[PDB]
């Protein structure tokens, strides 16, 4: 349940949509169907990766060693581009995918 809530991208409530994504993007998200199909396929791929991870790492250890520090890169991007977290953004989730 926590995994689905954290990684699902509910596109139905539409109030979270108006609060987080911009107005010209929320109408696009609510109108298109190819966007919704891609967004559901992304979560399907994430679920399969979750099962693969659980097979590779029993005993539930998250700590791992990998080459790129994604969270610190995201923090640097936020500070470099003066991102304000209190406002809706202009990033299209299809562009993200």
């Amino acid at each position: 349940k926590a995994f689905e809530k954290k990684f699902r991208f509910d596109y139905t409530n539409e109030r979270a949509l108006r609060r987080t994504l911009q107005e010209d993007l929320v109408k696009d998200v609510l109108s298109n169907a190819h966007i919704q199909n891609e967004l559901e396929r992304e979560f399907e791929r994430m679920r399969e990766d979750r099962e693969v991870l659980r097979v590779i790492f029993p005993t539930g250890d998250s700590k791992v060693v990998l080459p790129c520090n994604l969270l610190r890169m995201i923090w640097n991007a936020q500070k470099i581009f003066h991102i304000n977290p209190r406002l809706p953004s202009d990033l299209h989730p299809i562009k993200v995918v």
């Binding site: 409530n13 500070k79 304000n84």
Partner: protein, 148 residues
């Protein structure tokens, strides 16, 4: 103007947990007519404060009494603009976090702005309507003056 906030506070505690530092004490003030809690660290050696004191707090984005910003570069030989020198205690910090009472759908009704004055922190909770002048990474001045 450039005055983001202005209110009169009363000191309720000086160190509820204990004396953590020799020359720094953490005031726990509460507002009047605004109902805005404050948690401020004040150099007490230079500016002594004791219980029950009332001071007028002003938080301004500039000191120059006309609107122009300062660029953050120190210069003492600039008395020409006649800065806001009617206060006793002045600090200079950078707001680093604006917590809120948001949710998935409803917007926030109470905010909490944190400012770091080169180590000496400050949290200023209250209503979300009079706390709108604060944006993160923005330089902010603090001005205090004890009322007799």
């Amino acid at each position: 103007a450039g005055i983001l906030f202005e209110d009169i506070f009363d000191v309720k505690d000086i160190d509820p947990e204990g004396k953590k530092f020799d020359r720094v004490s953490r005031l726990h003030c509460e507002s009047e007519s605004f109902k805005m809690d404050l948690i401020l660290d004040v150099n007490i050696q230079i500016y002594p404060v004791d219980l029950g004191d009332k001071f007028r707090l002003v938080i301004a984005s500039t000191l120059y009494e006309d609107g122009t910003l300062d660029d953050g570069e120190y210069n003492p030989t600039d008395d020409r603009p006649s800065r806001a020198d009617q206060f006793e205690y002045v600090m200079y910090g950078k707001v680093y976090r604006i917590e809120g009472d948001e949710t998935s759908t409803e917007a926030a009704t109470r905010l909490s702005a944190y400012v770091s004055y080169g180590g000496l922190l400050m949290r200023l909770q209250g209503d979300a309507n009079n706390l709108h002048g604060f944006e993160v990474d923005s330089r902010v001045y603090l001005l205090m003056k004890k009322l007799a």
